[PDB]
Design a protein around this motif. Structure first.
Motif: not given
Ligand SMILES: [Zn+2]
Lengths: 39, 267
Positions: B102-110
């Motif tokens: 269960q990761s909450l990362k949505r995009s690689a870009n910040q």
């Protein structure tokens, strides 16, 4: 004559193959940028 | 060996169970018959509880005997560090599994470029394990490495990479000539049989499925782990219909994450 022409052909094909690989990496970067553009 | 560890912990719990069950027999007999409305009902309840307790004692004794049949045979600072190391390792394994599910990362870009020597080291590392798979790297066209993975007497897989990331795969049978007239790899062919065209399709879904974004070693290692399971083609039956043949096809689907055989019609 045959050996000289074979060496010239092999040099041309090595140049072309390396060109294709470098152009392919650039194309990958450009595809990512163009398709992920917001517009 | 670990089996002695498991048998000893098993028999430890067997002794504790035997002791507690004997004490439970005598404790329930201490209290005596309860009331339970119907007289017939109270007699039934007392008899049933006593019988169950006696049966549990017998089962625990039998299990202890079975483990007996199966059993085989400043310094404290080091052992404390050893115990704490194993504890930290197991704790970190569980927490890492729970968190990367269960990761909450949505995009690689910040707000791809690799030496081919590194590719050869990685693929030779994979070839050292799996002793029935032989991987033979070659580079006929530039830096894009092409791999022949033979697999038992069953498969020959032609994997075409692109910068240490699998790109295309073609699965052909053992006898099939994977070489062209000039002895180069036939990168563009099909395999004359229905089965291996199905396995090419499943291999393309496999390379579309095992995709980590950054680290590619887990990808190639997991792809070879999945590919290794195809050695039991023509021997494994389908885990849905039991049979071997649906429309004259063996079960061509080795499922990801649980390598089980299925006919692709049985999903
Ligand atoms: Zn089936």
């Amino acid at each position: 004559r045959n050996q000289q022409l074979r060496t010239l052909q092999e040099e041309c094909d090595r140049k072309l193959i390396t060109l294709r690989d470098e152009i392919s990496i650039d194309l990958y970067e450009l595809e990512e940028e163009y398709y992920s553009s917001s517009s | 060996v670990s089996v002695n560890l498991e048998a000893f912990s098993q028999a430890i719990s067997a002794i504790q169970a035997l002791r507690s069950s004997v004490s439970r027999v005598f404790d329930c007999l201490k209290d005596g018959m309860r009331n339970k409305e119907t007289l017939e009902g109270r007699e039934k309840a007392f008899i049933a509880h006593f019988q169950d307790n006696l049966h549990s004692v017998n089962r625990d004794l039998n299990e202890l005997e079975r483990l007996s049949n199966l059993v085989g045979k400043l310094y404290s600072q080091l052992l404390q560090a050893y115990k704490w190391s194993n504890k930290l390792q197991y704790h970190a394994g569980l927490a890492s599994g729970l968190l990367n599910q269960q990761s909450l990362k949505r995009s690689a870009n910040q707000m791809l470029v690799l030496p081919p020597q590194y590719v050869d080291d990685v693929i030779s590392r994979i070839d050292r394990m799996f002793p029935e798979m032989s991987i033979h790297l070659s580079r006929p066209n530039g830096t894009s490495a092409m791999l022949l993975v033979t697999l038992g007497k069953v498969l020959k897989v032609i994997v075409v990479m692109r910068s240490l990331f699998i790109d295309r795969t073609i699965v052909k049978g053992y006898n099939e000539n994977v070489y062209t007239e000039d002895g180069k790899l036939d990168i563009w062919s099909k395999s004359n049989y229905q089965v291996f065209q199905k396995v090419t399709d499943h291999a393309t879904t496999a390379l579309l499925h095992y995709q980590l974004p950054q680290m590619p070693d887990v990808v190639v290692r997991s792809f070879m782990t999945w590919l290794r399971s195809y050695i039991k083609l023509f021997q494994a039956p389908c885990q849905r219909c039991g049979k071997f043949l649906q429309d004259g096809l063996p079960p061509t689907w080795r499922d990801f994450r649980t390598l089980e055989a299925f006919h692709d019609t049985c999903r």
